[PDB]
Amino acid sequence: VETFAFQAEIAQLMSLIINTFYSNKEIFLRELISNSSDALDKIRYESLTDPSKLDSGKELHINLIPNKQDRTLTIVDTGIGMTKADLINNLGTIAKSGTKAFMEALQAGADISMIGQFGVGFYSAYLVAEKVTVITKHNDDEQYAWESSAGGSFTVRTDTGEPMGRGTKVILHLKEDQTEYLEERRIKEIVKKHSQFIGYPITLFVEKERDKE
């Protein structure tokens, strides 16, 4: 297991999100679905000139999986996935130009929904999750797990769980006061409100239901 420090302003932002009350938390799901959609676009365009890039799975889609027993909401996609280097670089160690401006905007009363416009959309996960685990598989790298409960660092390790062919799974270990995001109707209404124009199928597990479509 390897441990990495978040870039200082990203650590500051995470602390702010965790320790300051914001309403409109539901936008975390929009932000994670947008990341899945971007990752799906990436592999889709790569496959146009190299169809073998889909040998690890031709289906391009997003699954939403609430688990009441474990108190987790998982967002799974069959997108491009992240290499080990991608995880380390893109999910915490590299500065984002908009972080300080976003924190200033929040102090001045901006809605937390603006997070994506400032280039730090992923960190919305910490509005509702005490811990986030990201399991990811990119072509020509092994499967990896990134994890953080905030507090300034994250870990990366090779994953020995169930193999994914290709893509990313973001596992949200929800705070005890945010279990509404495990409910079928709640998830449906947030997807309808915020993610209605995503151009890939989105499936909800309750047994299994295509949204919606």
* Residues making up the binding site: 35, 77, 96, 122
For position 11 contacting ligand ANP by CB under 6 A, the verdict is: no
- Positions in 166-185 near ligand ANP (CB under 6 A): 168
Cβ contact 135:143 at 8 Å: yes
Specify the amino acid at residue 67. Answer: N
Stretch that binds ligand ANP, among 21-29, 33-41, 175-183, 194-202 (CB under 6 A): 33-41
Please report how many Cα atoms fall inside a 13 Å half-sphere around the Cα of residue 119, on the Cβ side. 12
Nearer to ligand ANP, 35 or 113 (CB): 35
Residue of 12, 56, 90, 149 that binds ligand ANP (CB under 6 A): 90
Which of ligand ANP, Mg ion, none is residue 127 near (CB under 5 to 8 Å by kind)? none
Element (H, E) at 19: helix 8-19
With CA atoms as reference, report the closest residue to 5 among 131, 115, 98, 92. 92
User: By the criterion CB under 5 A, which residues form the site for Mg ion?
Assistant: 35, 121
Q: Rounded to an integer, what distance in angstroms lies between the CA atom of residue 170 and that of residue 86?
A: 15
Helix 27-49 × helix 184-194 angle, to 10°: 60
Cβ contact 172:129 at 8 Å: yes
With CA atoms as reference, report the closest residue to 28 among 210, 150, 170, 135. 170
Stretch that binds ligand ANP, among 1-9, 51-59, 74-82, 189-197 (CB under 6 A): 74-82
With CA atoms as reference, report the closest residue to 120 among 9, 4, 3, 5. 9
For position 126 contacting ligand ANP by CB under 6 A, the verdict is: no
Cβ contact 192:31 at 8 Å: no
For position 92 contacting ligand ANP by CB under 6 A, the verdict is: no
Stretch that binds ligand ANP, among 3-11, 12-20, 29-37, 195-203 (CB under 6 A): 29-37
With CA atoms as reference, report the closest residue to 85 among 123, 136, 120. 136
For position 91 contacting ligand ANP by CB under 6 A, the verdict is: yes
Cβ contact 101:118 at 8 Å: yes
Nearer to ligand ANP, 38 or 55 (CB): 38
Nearer to ligand ANP, 111 or 183 (CB): 111
For position 120 contacting ligand ANP by CB under 6 A, the verdict is: yes
For position 82 contacting ligand ANP by CB under 6 A, the verdict is: yes
Binding residues for ATP: 35, 77, 96, 122
Residue ranges that bind ligand ANP, judged by CB under 6 A: 31, 34-36, 38-39, 77, 79-80, 82, 90-91, 116, 119-122, 168
